[PDB]
Amino acid sequence: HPETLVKVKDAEDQLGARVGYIELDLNSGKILESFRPEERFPMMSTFKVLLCGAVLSRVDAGQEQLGRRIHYSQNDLVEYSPVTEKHLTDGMTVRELCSAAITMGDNTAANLLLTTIGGPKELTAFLHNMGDHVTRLDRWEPELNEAIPNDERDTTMPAAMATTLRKLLTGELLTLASRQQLIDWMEADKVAGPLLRSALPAGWFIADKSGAGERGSRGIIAALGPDGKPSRIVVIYTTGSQATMDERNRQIAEIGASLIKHW
C-alpha cells in the first residue's frame, strides 16, 4: 500500500539515509510494494539465513550431516560469539552452529559454517545457481559488515533477497524437512526483538533475521502473517545513517506497523 511507502520515505528523512523495502506475496511471489528494489545494500548478518540454506542443501545432497561435530579453537573466535565461546572444548554440531548463527547471531558459528561449504565464493555460486544473480558474499565475519559507501562486496538488492528467501522457505530448492528446519531457526530468532517483532499483533507468525553493521547499516528479512502462518515476505535495509541504534530500530518498526495496518 502506498501509505507504507510514505513511512519508508519518512524513515529516509528521519535517518538521513537510503532505505530499501520489499513486501512480497509468499504464495505467488508477486511484489506488492517496493522502494529502491534494485539498489544495493550491505546484507550484514541477514546473510546467515542464506548460509544455512546452503548448508541444508548440502545435507539434502548427502554432502553434509546436521549431526557432524565441528571442532575449533580460540584462534577461530571473533567478536560476539555467545554460544561458540562456551564450546571450545566440546565442539559443536552443524545443526547447533546454524541454530547459534541464526537465532543467537553468533559470528564464529557463521565463519565455521562458511568454511564447511567452501567459503564466500561457494555461497555466491549457490545463490547464482538458484537464480539470484546479484547477491554476493565476499568476506568473512567481522569484515563483511564494513559497509563502505558504493562497495558492492557483501551486498544484496531488496528484490533479490526477498525472492531468494521465498525460494528457500517455500520453493523446491530444499527438501520439506530442510525448509521447515530453516524457518524453525528463523522463528526462534532471539535478537531481533526491537524490529518487526515489536509491531506484530498477538497471534501472528514471524520468522526473521536481522543485521547491523558499520555506517548506520541495519536490516531485516522476514516471513510473517496472521493466524500463526506466514503469507508475505518483508525485506528492509538501510545504510549511511548517523542515527542511533534506537532511532534506526524505531524507524524499521514503524514501517512494520504500517505494513500490518494496511495488510
Swiss-Prot record:
Pfam family, one: Beta-lactamase2
Gene Ontology MF, one: beta-lactamase activity
EC number per UniProt: 3.5.2.6
Uses in biotechnology: This protein is used as a marker in many commonly used cloning vectors, such as pBR322 and the pUC series.
EC primary class: hydrolase
PROSITE patterns, A to Z: BETA_LACTAMASE_A
Result of changing residue 213 to S: In TEM-3, TEM-4 and TEM-8
InterPro entries, A to Z: Beta-lactam/transpept-like, Beta-lactam_cat, Beta-lactam_class-A, Beta-lactam_class-A_AS
Active site residues per record: 45 (acyl-ester intermediate), 143 (proton acceptor)
Cysteine pairs bridged by disulfides in the record: 52-98
Reactions catalysed: a beta-lactam + H2O = a substituted beta-amino acid
Protein family (similarity comment): Belongs to the class-A beta-lactamase family.
Name of the featured protein: Beta-lactamase TEM
